[PDB]
């Protein structure tokens, strides 16, 4: 069944300097293959932690991830004007991969990945996304998508590793297909059959791999293309 993790507080409000934790649960045991993200105000997404406790290049060691079995915290001390934004947690131990639903923090008083194809469809129609890479050897790299939705979760839509083995959440299964293109370096989702509940914000993303045989980070994130299904 499906590791949800949940994020007891949705907002934290604190001020400069301070020490802040933020929660992070798993319903079942993930053998520390907790990944954390942040996303900054203006929508932009980074890794910030993998395997529960291993930063993610620079970021500073005002940031400590903890945890094991199914508790999970990251502590931001310090707090400096670019720590105000949501952070996500991640579990990579099973699929489908799963987020919490993120905890806002408030303050009190190169690899380039580029989406493209969104539009406004009715449903049961049809789109092609495109996410052109550059500045790496995009053909040995895992790439997923994940979306966002308009209540700001985040959730894993599908993964495609560089030879091209595929990897569904089911709830899109067999209406979305991933592909890639290893010359053009460029990643697909062919959504076909579209449901209103697709409407999102969909995001490609460049795994690392962290431990074999699958746990993997989202080590960088493209800003999104825009998908609106509307009767
Ligand atoms: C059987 O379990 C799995 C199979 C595949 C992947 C997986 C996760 C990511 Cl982020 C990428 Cl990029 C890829 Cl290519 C595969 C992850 C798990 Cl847990
Ligand atoms: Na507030």
């Known amino acids: ?12 409000s604190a001020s400069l300097g301070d ?31 993998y395997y529960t406790s291993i930063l993610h290049s620079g970021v500073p060691s005002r940031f400590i991830g903890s945890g ?6 990251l502590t931001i001390s310090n707090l400096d004007q670019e720590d105000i934004a949501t952070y996500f947690c991640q579990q990579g131990y099973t699929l489908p991969l799963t987020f919490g639903a993120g905890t806002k923090l408030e303050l009190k008083r190169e690899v380039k990945l ?14 092609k996304l ?3 890479a550059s500045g790496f050897t995009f053909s040995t790299y895992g790439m997923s998508w994940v979306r966002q939705t308009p209540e700001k979760r985040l959730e894993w839509v599908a993964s495609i590793s560089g030879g091209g083995d595929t990897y569904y959440t089911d709830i899109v299964k067999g209406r979305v297909t991933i592909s890639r293109d290893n010359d053009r370096n460029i990643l697909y989702l062919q959504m076909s059959s579209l449901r209103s509940e697709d409407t999102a914000m ?14 993997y980070s989202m080590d960088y ?5 825009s998908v609106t299904v509307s009767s």
Do not use: F
């Open 1 to 12: 069944m499906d590791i949800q993790m949940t994020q007891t507080a949705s907002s934290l």
């Open 68 to 73: 094991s079995g199914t508790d999970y915290s």
């Open 130 to 132: 495109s996410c052109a």
């Open 19 to 49: 020490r802040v934790t933020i929660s992070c649960r798993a319903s079942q045991y993930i053998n520390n293959y907790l990944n954390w993200y942040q996303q900054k105000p203006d929508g932009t997404v980074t890794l910030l932690i």
């Open 202 to 215: 969909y995001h490609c993303t460049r795994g690392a791999l962290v431990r074999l045989p699958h746990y």
């Open 221 to 225: 994130w493209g800003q999104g293309t």
């Open 114 to 127: 580029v989406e493209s194809g969104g539009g406004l469809v009715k449903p049961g129609g049809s789109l």
